[PDB]
Amino acid sequence: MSKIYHHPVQIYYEDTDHSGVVYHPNFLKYFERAREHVIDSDKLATLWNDHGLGFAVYKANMIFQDGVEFAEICDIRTSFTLDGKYKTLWRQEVWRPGASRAAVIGDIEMVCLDKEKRLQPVPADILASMMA
Amino acid sequence: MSKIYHHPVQIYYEDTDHSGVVYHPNFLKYFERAREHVIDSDKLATLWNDHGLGFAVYKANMIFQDGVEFAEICDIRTSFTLDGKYKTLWRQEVWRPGASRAAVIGDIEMVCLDKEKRLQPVPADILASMMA
Amino acid sequence: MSKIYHHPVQIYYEDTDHSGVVYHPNFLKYFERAREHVIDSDKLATLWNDHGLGFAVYKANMIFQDGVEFAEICDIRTSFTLDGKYKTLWRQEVWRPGASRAAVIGDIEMVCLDKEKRLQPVPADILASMMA
Amino acid sequence: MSKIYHHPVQIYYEDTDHSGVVYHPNFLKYFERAREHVIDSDKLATLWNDHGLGFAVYKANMIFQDGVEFAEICDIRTSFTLDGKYKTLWRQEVWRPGASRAAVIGDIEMVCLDKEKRLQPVPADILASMMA
């Protein structure tokens, strides 16, 4: 497993529901953002523009342990491990300010697809970026 | 102006914020859905797949007059008028169940663009569908 | 496990991303809608308005097997099983038109919380509604 | 009119649609975030938690002049002017990197409501924060 990467996410009105906490599907959005920052979003845009390759989530196993509130700045904490040429495993967690446990945990499995939905190996330049 | 078209929208947890009403940007989503139903979404998909044409909102003038609540089934009420070969004007309103006034009003101006963001005339088959 | 319930979901511009398929976090929204229709959304609104009880997803294990496209009307197929007084297990699947396999699978575990985030038994009136 | 405030927004997969640009309703989300940063989101949370006051958009007049693309970091540029005790007028613009014109323009009118949807004057502490 890699080191832990950190990405802040602020909770705005778009993120909450009428129950007073973050609406749960939004956590996968925050996890997506955080993976982009590990990879480098400019490299993702170049890879898609120039080669029509992009990544897809194959599996996501989520645990929602605590409610996250409006105006919190949470830390998305991410690590990755390579699992062969095709798969990347991500551990991602949402931590509320000062918390002693993750509010949300995800174990995510990612693949790389072309525009025909065929699996492709993770490009070396992406892996380089991820490990830089 | 055309007749009024009706499209129901149910308000789920994804639609509300912690203030207890629908989060205002979502109303433009509902208006988008309702326009698709006037046009025929299958025709929109064929037009984009086969010709790379699609529509874009150029202007949206919104009035938010009342809060919409969880579990309401609202009526999106839409009419259109053609304004030359390029522009379509839409009047769209969200009506809460039993209400005597619209909760949300939009005056929307739509154009048709190719993939290079060039303005194109509204295709006759789209206009036919809209007026069918 | 209950019978399979069916809930249609149409894919609009709000649902897709620039890769040309549904953006994966949105599937959990569709699953949420479908659970509301099993439960009865009016009962959920009365339970929250009158008693300040509502449901929360504790776990969601997702498999994303195929990309879903613009203008498809998918079928969300849902079943539930009770697992004691506190937990409800849901199996939910997105089926593209005419498909021979689910595009998306979720195994969801749901709890019932009060406003203090304390676990509560599923109310009998909710269970009645679910089994009606 | 106040000075111009700046708030960056990065465009992720959640922001785009299959046409390859930002899905237009999302711009109002970015405008909402930017207003929170002018006001101070902690003050908004305290005002809602302690007094049950919050702000609402009454009017939004939007112009969408250019498409915004994946992985861009745009600048949301905001100014405000007070229009009596009840209303606040906001001018908000999305600027793509290096652009010579705004991609999106909004003229937004904001009010302050209690939980009964009654109009209230903008609290002095909010105005202080806004002008700090």
TrEMBL record, chains A, B, C, D:
Keywords for this protein: Hydrolase, Metal-binding
PROSITE patterns associated with the record: 4HBCOA_THIOESTERASE (PS01328)
Gene Ontology molecular function terms on file: hydrolase activity; metal ion binding
Pfam families assigned: 4HBT_2
CDD domains the record matches: 4HBT (cd00586)
Coiled coil: none
UniProt keyword annotation of Acetylation present: no
Sites where the protein binds Mg(2+): 51, 125
Family under the similarity heading: Belongs to the 4-hydroxybenzoyl-CoA thioesterase family.
Protein name: Uncharacterized protein
